[PDB]
Amino acid sequence: XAAXLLLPX
């Protein structure tokens, strides 16, 4: 999602 390139995404 809007968490850089780290889960959850």
CB-based contacts of 3, cutoff 8 Å, min separation 6: 9
Q: Which amino acid is at 8?
A: P
What is the chain's length?
Answer: 9
Judging by beta carbons within 10 Å of its beta carbon (0-12, 13-18, 19+), is residue 9 exposed, middle or buried? Answer: exposed
Query: What technique solved it?
Result: NMR
**Side-chain-side CA neighbours of residue 6 (13 Å):** 2
Distance CA 2, CA 6 (A): 9
User: Around 7, how many Cα atoms within 13 Å sit in the side-chain half-sphere?
Assistant: 1
> Biggest alpha carbon distance in the chain?
10
Burial of 7 (0-12, 13-18, 19+ CB in 10 A): exposed
The three-state DSSP-derived secondary structure of the chain is CCCCCCCCC
